């Protein structure tokens, strides 16, 4: 009866895998961003005449 | 008979998840805006010759 | 959490292919935008500073 054909067991399986993978991808993105920051700290401090 | 196909229980579950997600998104937006403000306070005070 | 019930209405396969296309476009946009700057371009010789 579900419009996707999933059986509430396939749905739970996919939800577990997908949530874990999204969190994993965000985590490796965080680590890559930290490495880039050590290469180029991209948010500079406020320059002297800035208002 | 619902227009969305959701039962009453699924409507309530979706409502809880939707409101939680929206509130968390807006709260992290508030926190992030504060952090950005510490980086760049974007609304400058009224300058000297401003009327 | 009943969040998994989302996949009873969204067809994971189609969601994933659309998300893949969107994320590819955004990543290309960001890479190109950085390469269009002097400060954060990592391909070219450093320009824009003495």
């Amino acid at each position: 009866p579900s419009l996707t054909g999933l059986t509430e067991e396939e749905a739970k399986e996919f939800h577990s895998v997908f949530v874990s993978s999204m969190v994993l991808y965000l985590a490796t993105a965080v680590i890559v961003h930290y490495l880039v920051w050590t290469a180029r700290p991209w948010i500079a401090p406020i320059p002297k005449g800035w208002v | 008979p619902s227009l969305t196909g959701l039962t009453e229980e699924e409507a309530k579950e979706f409502h809880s998840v939707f409101v939680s997600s929206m509130v968390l998104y807006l709260a992290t937006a508030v926190i992030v805006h504060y952090l950005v403000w510490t980086a760049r306070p974007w609304i400058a005070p009224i300058p000297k010759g401003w009327v | 959490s009943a969040s998994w019930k989302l996949w009873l209405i969204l067809d994971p396969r189609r969601v994933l292919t659309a998300l893949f296309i969107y994320l590819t476009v955004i990543a290309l946009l960001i890479h190109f935008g950085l390469l269009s700057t002097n400060r954060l371009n990592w391909w070219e010789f450093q320009r824009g500073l003495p």
Binding site: H15, V23, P41, I43 | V36 | S3
Partner: peptide
């Protein structure tokens, strides 16, 4: 010298980090 103690580094960490937490703590 870009380090972990650079204050502005919290801005990218905050935008990337905060949702990753509650994404894992709400939908899961």
């Amino acid at each position: 010298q870009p380090s972990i103690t650079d204050w502005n580094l919290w801005v990218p960490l905050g935008i990337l980090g905060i949702p990753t937490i509650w994404i894992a703590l709400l939908y899961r």
